[PDB]
Amino acid sequence: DWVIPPISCPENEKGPFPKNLVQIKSNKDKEGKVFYSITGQGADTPPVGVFIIERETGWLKVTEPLDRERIATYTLFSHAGNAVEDPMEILITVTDQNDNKPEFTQEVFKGSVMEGALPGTSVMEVTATDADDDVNTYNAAIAYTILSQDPELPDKNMFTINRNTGVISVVTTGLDRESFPTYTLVVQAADLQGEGLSTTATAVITVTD
Amino acid sequence: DVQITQSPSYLAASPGETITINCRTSKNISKYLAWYQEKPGKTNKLLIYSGYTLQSGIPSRFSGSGSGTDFTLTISSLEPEDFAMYYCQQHNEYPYTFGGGTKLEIKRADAAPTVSIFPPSSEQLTSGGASVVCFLNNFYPKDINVKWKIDGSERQNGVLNSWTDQDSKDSTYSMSSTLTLTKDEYERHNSYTCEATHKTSTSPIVKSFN
Amino acid sequence: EVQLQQSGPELVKPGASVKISCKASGYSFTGYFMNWVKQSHGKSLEWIGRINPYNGDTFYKQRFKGKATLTVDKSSSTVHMDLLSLTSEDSAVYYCGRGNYYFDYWGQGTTLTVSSAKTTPPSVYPLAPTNSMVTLGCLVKGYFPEPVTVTWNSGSLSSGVHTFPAVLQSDLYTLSSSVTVPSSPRPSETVTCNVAHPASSTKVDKKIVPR
Ligand SMILES: [Ca+2]
Ligand SMILES: [Ca+2]
Ligand SMILES: [Ca+2]
Numbered sequence: 001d002w003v004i005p006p007i008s009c010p011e012n013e014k015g016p017f018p019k020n021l022v023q024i025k026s027n028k029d030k031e032g033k034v035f036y037s038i039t040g041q042g043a044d045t046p047p048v049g050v051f052i053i054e055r056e057t058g059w060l061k062v063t064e065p066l067d068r069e070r071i072a073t074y075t076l077f078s079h080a081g082n083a084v085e086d087p088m089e090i091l092i093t094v095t096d097q098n099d100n101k102p103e104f105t106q107e108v109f110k111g112s113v114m115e116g117a118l119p120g121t122s123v124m125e126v127t128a129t130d131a132d133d134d135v136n137t138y139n140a141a142i143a144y145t146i147l148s149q150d151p152e153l154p155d156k157n158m159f160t161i162n163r164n165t166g167v168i169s170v171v172t173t174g175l176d177r178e179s180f181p182t183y184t185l186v187v188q189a190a191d192l193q194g195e196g197l198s199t200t201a202t203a204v205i206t207v208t209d
Numbered sequence: 210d211v212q213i214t215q216s217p218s219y220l221a222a223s224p225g226e227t228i229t230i231n232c233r234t235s236k237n238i239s240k241y242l243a244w245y246q247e248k249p250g251k252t253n254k255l256l257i258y259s260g261y262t263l264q265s266g267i268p269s270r271f272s273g274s275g276s277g278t279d280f281t282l283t284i285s286s287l288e289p290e291d292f293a294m295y296y297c298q299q300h301n302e303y304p305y306t307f308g309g310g311t312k313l314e315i316k317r318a319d320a321a322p323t324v325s326i327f328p329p330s331s332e333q334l335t336s337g338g339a340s341v342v343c344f345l346n347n348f349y350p351k352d353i354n355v356k357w358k359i360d361g362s363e364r365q366n367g368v369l370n371s372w373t374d375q376d377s378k379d380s381t382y383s384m385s386s387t388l389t390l391t392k393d394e395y396e397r398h399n400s401y402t403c404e405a406t407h408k409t410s411t412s413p414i415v416k417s418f419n
Numbered sequence: 420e421v422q423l424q425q426s427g428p429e430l431v432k433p434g435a436s437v438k439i440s441c442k443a444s445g446y447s448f449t450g451y452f453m454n455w456v457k458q459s460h461g462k463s464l465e466w467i468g469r470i471n472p473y474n475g476d477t478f479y480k481q482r483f484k485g486k487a488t489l490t491v492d493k494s495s496s497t498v499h500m501d502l503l504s505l506t507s508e509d510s511a512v513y514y515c516g517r518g519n520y521y522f523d524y525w526g527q528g529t530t531l532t533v534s535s536a537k538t539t540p541p542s543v544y545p546l547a548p549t550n551s552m553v554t555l556g557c558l559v560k561g562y563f564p565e566p567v568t569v570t571w572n573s574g575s576l577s578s579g580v581h582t583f584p585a586v587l588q589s590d591l592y593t594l595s596s597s598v599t600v601p602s603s604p605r606p607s608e609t610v611t612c613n614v615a616h617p618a619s620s621t622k623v624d625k626k627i628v629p630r
Pocket of ligand 2: 011068069096097098099100131132133
């Protein structure tokens with residue numbers, strides 16, 4: 001049964017507004033003039049005015065930029081001195097722009113490793129979240145990297161981090177508590193699979209007995 | 210690249226007032242905007258980062274707001290220290306970019322310029338040059354115009370102007386103007402005049418030499 | 420206390436290159452990216468690029484690739500910036516700043532002047548004058564190696580002074596200074612300006628005698 005498909009509108013759109021989205025028509029306009037109006041969130045119930053229509057032509061318009069991370073989808077109902085048609089469900093989908101950076105769940109992550117641990121030993125896990133669409137885009141696909149290690153002894157790279165999981169592991173023998181009891185790592189989480197927006201955090205690794 | 214429009218460029222206020230400075234960006238940068246303060250002889254000072262987070266050592270009368278494309282730095286109850294230059298910077302994405310800046314200057318009662326004219330010295334005329342210098346000192350506000358009139362005739366060639374910043378002790382502005390000619394081009398005329406047009410007078414202040 | 424200390428001012432002819440250095444202290448050096456920012460006179464701040472001190476990893480603003488090279492020396496907590504094939508457009512103040520995103524600490528800046536002019540001593544010219552207050556001055560013209568220092572009566576007379584920022588006139592700088600005294604029925608005192616110009620070893624006094 002012929003229905004209007006979901007209307008997709010990207011967020012963060014620039015001017016000028018109003019901007020046309022879709023036109024709806026009732027073939028009952030053949031006999032006489034029809035008055036169009038829409039209801040729902042974004043037009044009737046809050047929020048208000050985001051989506052409007054002009055009753056003479058039936059052009060569904062948007063009047064201000066959208067934000068997918070607030071309202072991801074709208075559902076409206078189009079209408080036509082008497083009712084002409086049973087209401088039509090008009091679904092509006094806000095498509096994603098990469099406008100949020102990955103954030104670590106905390107600023108400092110604590111972790112501990114045993115001295116003499118063999119390479120591959122899991123030390124700790126850092127975690128970040130990105131608020132963008134991680135199912136239809138890469139705007140939330142996070143890669144983890146190590147930006148620095150302090151100190152650089154016995155080796156410059158005592159640890160590695162898994163690009164996808166954030167697990168930090170030992171890669172080199174020689175961890176010694178009496179020698180170097182603490183390591184500080186700056187970790188970065190970037191979206192677009194590591195090529196996009198980033199933030200940093202700190203991992204503090206204590207070497208135990 | 211993220212372009213930033215920072216407005217206004219200049220802003221005059223008094224201690225105790227509240228002022229706002231705005232940055233609009235060309236891309237949605239979420240919250241990642243920072244504000245800095247610049248003062249002569251001091252390294253630049255971070256005030257706010259990530260839109261609204263007050264940096265250590267900064268009093269809370271500095272506050273930031275906004276997210277997306279519109280950001281505001283607000284300074285409540287201005288102290289004399291607050292009168293300075295201010296910049297925003299997006300730290301969302303490479304390449305990092307800055308707003309064009311805002312100069313927060315201190316309000317002051319209007320003041321007419323004290324203007325003095327000086328003919329070329331004996332030594333300079335022996336060297337072969339002739340620079341007539343005109344001073345316009347301790348005026349407010351800073352907006353001012355200078356016309357040079359050599360024997361009643363306006364001349365815009367050979368003029369060099371230089372302005373001070375707002376004075377720290379009395380909040381005024383001063384300006385220096387210098388027409389530069391040579392003995393050959395100089396002694397062909399008799400009278401030389403600079404006239405200053407300023408808010409404080411409906412008719413320009415005139416000082417002349419013969 | 421964090422501190423970013425930059426190398427001194429550079430005066431070089433066009434076509435040359437300079438290396439500006441910035442030494443960090445008070446924190447773990449490799450924990451934060453270092454940045455270089457350009458600010459031309461009257462113009463706004465411009466980010467040039469950054470370097471990760473841990474591994475020398477760099478990122479440049481496009482229009483500075485081939486103009487700027489960032490390097491690091493971990494053993495001395497110093498970052499370097501090379502500026503190649505210099506032009507007058509490169510004349511600016513250059514700042515280093517700490518931070519992967521925003522810059523919570525800055526250096527005091529390094530001034531770069533790119534010019535083909537030779538070191539020239541200034542010509543000092545008196546500016547002699549009656550109102551109750553009287554304005555005197557002296558003109559400092561035709562020098563290139565910036566800066567100069569103007570004092571009146573060896574700094575004893577200091578209030579009422581306006582030393583104006585220099586102006587570039589045909590590859591040479593000209594500057595003027597003014598001083599106002601409320602001279603009275605007493606015979607007007609003698610007044611001389613003391614122009615110091617370091618880069619030419621020039622100490623000159625010109626006494627202002629009214630015509
Ligand atoms: Ca959004
Ligand atoms: Ca988004
Ligand atoms: Ca994202």
